[PDB]
């Protein structure tokens, strides 16, 4: 979740998942 665009949910892994909340 690098600002709201292509950094969040970047393919399914460490780009979504950011702790355990709404990032994953």
Curated annotation (Swiss-Prot):
Its primary physiological function is unclear. May play a role in neuronal development and synaptic plasticity. May be required for neuronal myelin sheath maintenance. May promote myelin homeostasis through acting as an agonist for ADGRG6 receptor. May play a role in iron uptake and iron homeostasis. Soluble oligomers are toxic to cultured neuroblastoma cells and induce apoptosis (in vitro). Association with GPC1 (via its heparan sulfate chains) targets PRNP to lipid rafts. Also provides Cu(2+) or Zn(2+) for the ascorbate-mediated GPC1 deaminase degradation of its heparan sulfate side chains. Cu(2+) 2 binds at residues 9-11. The chain holds residues 61 to 84 of 253 of the full protein. The normal, monomeric form, PRPN(C), has a mainly alpha-helical structure. Misfolding of this form produces a disease-associated, protease-resistant form, PRPN (Sc), accompanied by a large increase of the beta-sheet content and formation of amyloid fibrils. These fibrils consist of a cross-beta spine, formed by a steric zipper of superposed beta-strands. Disease mutations may favor intermolecular contacts via short beta strands, and may thereby trigger oligomerization. It is linked to PrP is found in high quantity in the brain of humans and animals infected with neurodegenerative diseases known as transmissible spongiform encephalopathies or prion diseases, like: Creutzfeldt-Jakob disease (CJD), fatal familial insomnia (FFI), Gerstmann-Straussler disease (GSD), Huntington disease-like type 1 (HDL1) and kuru in humans; scrapie in sheep and goat; bovine spongiform encephalopathy (BSE) in cattle; transmissible mink encephalopathy (TME); chronic wasting disease (CWD) of mule deer and elk; feline spongiform encephalopathy (FSE) in cats and exotic ungulate encephalopathy (EUE) in nyala and greater kudu. Cu(2+) 3 binds at residues 17-19. Belongs to the prion family. The glycosylation pattern (the amount of mono-, di- and non-glycosylated forms or glycoforms) seems to differ in normal and CJD prion. It comes from the Eukaryota. It is found in: Cell membrane; Golgi apparatus. This protein is produced by a bicistronic gene which also produces the alternative prion protein/AltPrP (AC F7VJQ1) from an overlapping reading frame. The alternative prion protein/AltPrP (AC F7VJQ1) and PRNP have no apparent direct functional relation since a mutation that removes the start codon of the AltPrP has no apparent effect on the biology of PRNP. In mouse and hamster, the alternative initiation AUG codon is absent and is replaced by a GUG codon. This is Major prion protein. Cu(2+) 1 binds at residues 1-3. Monomer and homodimer. Has a tendency to aggregate into amyloid fibrils containing a cross-beta spine, formed by a steric zipper of superposed beta-strands. Soluble oligomers may represent an intermediate stage on the path to fibril formation. Copper binding may promote oligomerization. Interacts with GRB2, APP, ERI3/PRNPIP and SYN1. Mislocalized cytosolically exposed PrP interacts with MGRN1; this interaction alters MGRN1 subcellular location and causes lysosomal enlargement. Interacts with KIAA1191. Interacts with ADGRG6.
């Amino acid at each position: 979740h690098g600002g709201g665009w292509g950094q969040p949910h970047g393919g399914g892994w460490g780009q979504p998942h950011g702790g355990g909340w709404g990032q994953p």
